[PDB]
Amino acid sequence: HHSGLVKMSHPSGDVEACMVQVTCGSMTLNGLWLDNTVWCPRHVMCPADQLSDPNYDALLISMTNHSFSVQKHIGAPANLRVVGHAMQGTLLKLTVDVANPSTPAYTFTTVKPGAAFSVLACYNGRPTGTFTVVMRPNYTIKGSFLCGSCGSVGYTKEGSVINFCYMHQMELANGTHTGSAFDGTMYGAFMDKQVHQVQLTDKYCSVNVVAWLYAAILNGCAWFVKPNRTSVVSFNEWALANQFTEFVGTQSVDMLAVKTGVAIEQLLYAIQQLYTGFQGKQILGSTMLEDEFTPEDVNMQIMGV
Amino acid sequence: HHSGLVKMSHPSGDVEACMVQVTCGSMTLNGLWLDNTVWCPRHVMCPADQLSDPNYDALLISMTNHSFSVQKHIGAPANLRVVGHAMQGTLLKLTVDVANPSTPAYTFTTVKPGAAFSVLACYNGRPTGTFTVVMRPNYTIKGSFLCGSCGSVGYTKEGSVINFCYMHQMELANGTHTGSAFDGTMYGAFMDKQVHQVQLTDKYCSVNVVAWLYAAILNGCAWFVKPNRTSVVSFNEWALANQFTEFVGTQSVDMLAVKTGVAIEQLLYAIQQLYTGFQGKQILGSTMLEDEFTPEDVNMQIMGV
Ligand SMILES: *[C@H](O)[C@H](C[C@@H]1CCNC1=O)NC(=O)[C@H](CC(C)C)NC(=O)OC[C@@H]1CCC(=O)N1CC1CCC(F)(F)CC1
Ligand SMILES: *[C@H](O)[C@H](C[C@@H]1CCNC1=O)NC(=O)[C@H](CC(C)C)NC(=O)OC[C@@H]1CCC(=O)N1CC1CCC(F)(F)CC1
Numbered sequence: 001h002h003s004g005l006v007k008m009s010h011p012s013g014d015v016e017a018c019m020v021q022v023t024c025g026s027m028t029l030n031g032l033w034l035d036n037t038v039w040c041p042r043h044v045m046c047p048a049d050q051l052s053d054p055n056y057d058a059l060l061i062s063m064t065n066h067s068f069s070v071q072k073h074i075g076a077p078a079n080l081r082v083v084g085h086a087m088q089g090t091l092l093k094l095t096v097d098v099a100n101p102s103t104p105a106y107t108f109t110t111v112k113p114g115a116a117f118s119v120l121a122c123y124n125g126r127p128t129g130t131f132t133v134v135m136r137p138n139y140t141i142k143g144s145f146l147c148g149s150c151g152s153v154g155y156t157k158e159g160s161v162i163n164f165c166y167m168h169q170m171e172l173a174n175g176t177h178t179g180s181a182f183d184g185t186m187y188g189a190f191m192d193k194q195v196h197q198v199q200l201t202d203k204y205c206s207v208n209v210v211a212w213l214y215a216a217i218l219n220g221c222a223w224f225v226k227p228n229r230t231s232v233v234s235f236n237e238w239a240l241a242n243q244f245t246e247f248v249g250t251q252s253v254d255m256l257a258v259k260t261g262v263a264i265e266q267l268l269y270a271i272q273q274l275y276t277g278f279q280g281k282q283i284l285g286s287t288m289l290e291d292e293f294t295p296e297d298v299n300m301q302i303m304g305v
Numbered sequence: 306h307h308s309g310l311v312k313m314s315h316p317s318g319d320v321e322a323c324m325v326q327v328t329c330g331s332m333t334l335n336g337l338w339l340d341n342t343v344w345c346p347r348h349v350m351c352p353a354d355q356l357s358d359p360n361y362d363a364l365l366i367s368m369t370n371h372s373f374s375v376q377k378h379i380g381a382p383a384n385l386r387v388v389g390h391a392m393q394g395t396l397l398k399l400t401v402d403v404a405n406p407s408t409p410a411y412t413f414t415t416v417k418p419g420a421a422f423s424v425l426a427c428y429n430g431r432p433t434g435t436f437t438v439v440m441r442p443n444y445t446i447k448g449s450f451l452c453g454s455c456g457s458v459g460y461t462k463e464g465s466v467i468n469f470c471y472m473h474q475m476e477l478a479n480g481t482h483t484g485s486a487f488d489g490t491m492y493g494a495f496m497d498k499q500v501h502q503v504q505l506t507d508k509y510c511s512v513n514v515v516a517w518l519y520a521a522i523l524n525g526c527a528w529f530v531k532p533n534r535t536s537v538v539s540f541n542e543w544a545l546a547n548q549f550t551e552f553v554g555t556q557s558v559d560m561l562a563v564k565t566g567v568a569i570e571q572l573l574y575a576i577q578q579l580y581t582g583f584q585g586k587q588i589l590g591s592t593m594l595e596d597e598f599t600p601e602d603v604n605m606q607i608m609g610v
Contacts, residue, residue, distance in 0.1 A: 001479050001480050002447045002479060002480035002481045003480065004449055004450075004480055005449060006312075006436040006438070006447070006448060006449040007311075007312045007436060007437065008426075008435070008436050008449060009314060009434065010434065010435070010437050011318075011425065011432040011433070011434065011435055012315045012316045012317050012435070013316075013317060013319075013321040013322070013380075013432075014318075014320025016316050035389070053307060075318075120316065121313075127316040127318075128316070129313040129314065129315065129316065130314050130315070130317070130435060131311040131313050131314065131317055132310060133311070142307045143309075143312060144309055144310060144311040144606045145309075145310060146355070146606075146609045147609070174306050174307060175306050175308065175524070177310055183446075189351040189441050211347070219480070226364040281355045285593050286445035287593065288592065301449045301451075304451045304452070
């Protein structure tokens with residue numbers, strides 16, 4: 001029995017119309033054009049020779065407006081003249097002389113561990129694919145990004161408003177990815193330099209595991225549900241010892257508890273038992289806990305909320 | 306170590322600009338507007354009372370052009386006057402008096418089992434999500450579709466050309482989905498009626514399992530590779546007895562064999578052994594064979610081809 005769950009991304013058209021190519025000398029990557037501003041990773045200013053110890057303050061001072069070339073390729077082609085430049089953290093903010101006529105309603109936000117967002121992967125200012133990821137507890141994402149993908153953007157949508165939350169910067173040694181928020185801070189403790197970096201330990205996202213167990217119940221799969229219960233306080237002490245995030249309930253989780261009639265605390269107990277092993281059984285086709293689906297995913301895709 | 310594989314969909318903007326709402330009396334669903342034609346499922350003509358034994362020939366004759374209401378909501382709003390109507394298999398072909406000014410270059414094709422395509426899920430003519438699926442050997446897809454989703458479209462893209470291959474029609478008893486090709490035929494043996502239907506047995510897609518084992522090798526994971534080999538002929542005899550599709554090699558698979566230095570026949574042997582059990586080991590985070598990634602996915606996402 002198929003769960004009705006898929007990895008669902010937002011339709012990408014609104015964001016496709018904002019993607020541009022940014023070139024600075026021997027470097028090219030993607031940028032995001034909103035109003036009269038183009039955002040892109042600041043390492044577009046770095047010669048590949050110096051990526052391991054760049055002085056971005058000196059690189060920035062060495063640039064003029066004419067140092068940058070901004071091009072839109074798709075749909076409504078355009079070469080955009082740069083008329084100002086500035087650095088904010090790990091991003092450049094270029095000012096251009098034409099306002100994007102397809103600028104959507106938008107905000108900038110930071111995404112939290114366990115939360116999902118959509119990514120528009122782009123190369124040379126051309127969108128090539130879209131996928132959805134969850135921000136991991138160690139502030140990486142399990143993406144699919146190759147050389148040239150930097151400046152690809154991640155976002156959520158509330159109504160018609162696009163909430164931009166990620167601009168792609170780098171791949172870590174274990175194959176995961178990270179990037180910047182639009183305040184210019186890198187997610188986690190990462191730096192935008194080509195150097196070995198401590199990567200922090202990942203954890204299971206407890207709230208998303210709970211969501212997935214509710215999805216199982218909503219599909220008629222509830223063998224793992226018992227009367228037994230573990231309190232949030234007791235579960236969270238256990239989680240710190242067992243590489244789980246601490247559980248924080250939300251209204252979205254509460255809606256799943258009400259729909260199914262199964263208490264959160266019953267599923268916190270189930271998680272503790274299932275972590276020790278599924279004893280040969282499956283849940284929604286899986287022999288391991290799944291934490292890549294959020295309570296909101298389950299509410300939307302299964303309950304139509 | 307993350308594989309670098311995700312479920313990747315095409316950017317959806319080109320197709321978003323083709324989606325419309327079609328209403329016929331008490332029924333509303335989605336349609337696809339290309340040139341002066343709007344395609345939609347023919348059960349928009351059926352009153353919910355009669356969905357179990359409709360006479361679509363009589364329903365069609367009972368309609369006039371004014372029976373249909375076509376509306377575009379997003380981006381460039383419009384009410385489209387219907388000036389002709391026709392049935393092709395399980396689809397209606399409505400002719401409208403305005404050509405879609407955003408019609409992309411397009412073709413119609415039929416997708417084969419094991420092949421992947423992108424879906425734009427829509428409700429009331431409004432795109433709400435995108436995801437990618439593989440056509441299963443029993444001509445269903447493991448989608449995410451709720452009431453109102455019919456007329457949602459699936460497609461592939463070659464260059465700038467969109468190859469439309471699926472128009473959503475129904476959910477089966479096991480939670481999977483199926484629909485029509487744009488020649489109006491339903492995939493598989495399914496009919497567009499609200500009646501119990503024999504559903505055929507699914508199978509593992511052998512070529513995609515091979516692709517995934519190559520993805521594992523490309524990520525440094527090759528414990529399952531031995532000198533031992535099973536011929537395609539011998540594997541295909543085994544597959545018929547073990548709920549696997551017969552293996553048919555392609556140039557995309559050959560490219561993976563050349564890059565990795567591991568022969569297809571080595572992986573056909575591995576599959577036979579892994580099917581009997583992973584003996585407590587994991588491949589790319591999984592304790593079971595994965596068949597939802599195609600050779601083309603692996604070439605594109607990991608090898609950048
Ligand atoms: C921008 O387009 C690009 C995107 C990368 C390329 C490959 N996949 C991506 O997501 N970003 C970079 O190349 C980035 C640039 C710096 C200045 C921020 N560098 C980067 O991602 O380098 C990661 C390297 C290459 C692959 C890999 O495993 N690592 C990390 C690893 C390098 C060796 C080590 F010893 F230093 C340990 C860390
Ligand atoms: C069109 O918007 C809609 C899309 C469906 C709704 C739910 N999810 C979807 O993908 N299509 C239909 O409702 C479709 C209409 C007919 C005329 C083609 N009917 C349909 O999908 O019905 C499927 C039903 C409802 C859920 C379910 O399990 N089944 C199949 C099952 C019904 C009972 C049975 F005994 F007949 C055995 C088969």
